[PDB]
């Protein structure tokens, strides 16, 4: 229960809605990058060795 952490977040970035919107924009930018990278890694893991990315090395520059 990081009550102090939530208190700091509110007092600095939520009391005014202008700051509230700005945090949202930066958060989504970072979130999409992390979400996309993690999801693609999971997809590649489940399908290891079948995607063309995993076999192109056997023909590219070859």
């Amino acid at each position: 229960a990081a009550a102090t952490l939530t208190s700091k977040l509110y007092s600095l970035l939520f009391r005014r809605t202008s700051t509230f919107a700005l945090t949202i924009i930066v958060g989504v930018m970072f979130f999409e990058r992390a979400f996309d990278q993690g999801a693609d890694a999971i997809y590649d893991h489940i399908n290891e060795g079948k995607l063309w990315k995993h076999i192109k090395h056997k023909y590219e520059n070859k």
């Binding site: 005014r16 202008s18 700051t19 919107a21 700005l22 924009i25 930066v26 989504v28 930018m29 970072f30 990058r33 996309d36 990278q37």
Partner: protein
């Protein structure tokens, strides 16, 4: 227009200036994010990785 002048209308602008800057910043970042503008984005420490 002449009525808009006066000591207080200047004060009202001063109070709202911080809010105007923040809203302008919100719009600028939103535009860059929506458009995936590589020119500015290439100087972002982590987001730049997306670009290959």
């Amino acid at each position: 227009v002449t009525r808009f002048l006066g000591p207080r209308y200047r004060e009202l602008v001063k109070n709202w200036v911080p809010t105007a800057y923040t809203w302008g910043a919100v719009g600028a970042v939103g535009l860059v994010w929506a458009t995936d503008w590589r020119l500015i984005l290439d100087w972002v420490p982590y987001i730049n990785g997306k670009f290959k």
